[PDB]
């Protein structure tokens, strides 16, 4: 009756250990430009300076 109630607590603590190791993995994982920077306007391509612009200026 007491071995089962200790195995329950050990399972509940190993669950927290797995959760902690997971939530540590999750932060060091790299992340998208749409999640790290603003979601709308998801491309990093600037295309900036649009009045006196030259054709051939893109690459």
């Amino acid at each position: 009756d007491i071995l089962n109630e200790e195995a329950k607590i050990v399972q509940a603590l190993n669950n927290q250990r797995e959760l902690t190791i997971k939530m540590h993995e999750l932060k060091r994982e790299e992340k998208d430009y749409a999640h790290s920077y603003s979601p709308l306007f998801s491309d990093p391509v600037p295309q900036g300076g649009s009045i006196g612009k030259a054709p051939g200026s893109s690459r």
Partner: protein
């Protein structure tokens, strides 16, 4: 921002190298960034002309030591009074 806006409101001098570098960086995630090292190099010496200054010093070191100097189609210098004279 004013990321690539020039003095006339157009694109700046190194806009195209920067936009190529950002085209690089858009389709890559990290762990895979070592391949867009050349574009960045192309951008940086677009900015500062380090490798062209090195190359032109290497060629000027050789033309200083020639007694012959230049056997070439030469380049003329004019006064500003005489751009279309003859």
């Amino acid at each position: 921002t004013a990321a690539g806006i020039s003095l006339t409101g157009g694109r700046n001098r190194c806009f195209s190298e920067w936009q190529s570098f950002m085209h690089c960086t858009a389709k890559t995630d990290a762990k895979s960034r070592a391949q867009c090292l050349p574009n960045f190099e192309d951008y940086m010496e677009c900015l500062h002309h380090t490798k062209e200054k090195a190359r032109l010093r290497e060629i000027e070191s050789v033309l200083k030591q020639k007694k012959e100097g230049l056997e070439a189609p030469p380049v003329k210098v004019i006064p500003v009074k005489a751009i279309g004279l003859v």
